[PDB]
Nucleic acid binder design. Structure first.
Length: 63
DNA sequence: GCGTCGC
DNA sequence: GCGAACGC
């Protein structure tokens, strides 16, 4: 599955397999993900949006 | 402010 | 150490 979100004026669509860490900030689901060049990207979506795969990671990670 | 990269 | 980023 993929997560769609806008970050710094750019549209992003990241495969959920790449999501590194995920945490909750109120209604915001915030996360980091693996990118090319050994780098780590950041992203956030509304919980309303939030694919269940991503939300499950929260409950199953929270670390 | 809440939770957590790239100077 | 901190500005900026993200939905609210």
């Amino acid at each position: 599955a993929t997560v769609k979100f806008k970050y710094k004026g750019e549209e992003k669509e990241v495969d959920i397999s790449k999501i590194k860490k995920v945490w909750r900030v109120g209604k915001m689901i915030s996360f980091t993900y693996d990118e090319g060049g050994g780098k780590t990207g950041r992203g956030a979506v509304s919980e309303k949006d939030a694919p269940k795969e991503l939300l499950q990671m929260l409950e199953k990670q929270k670390k």
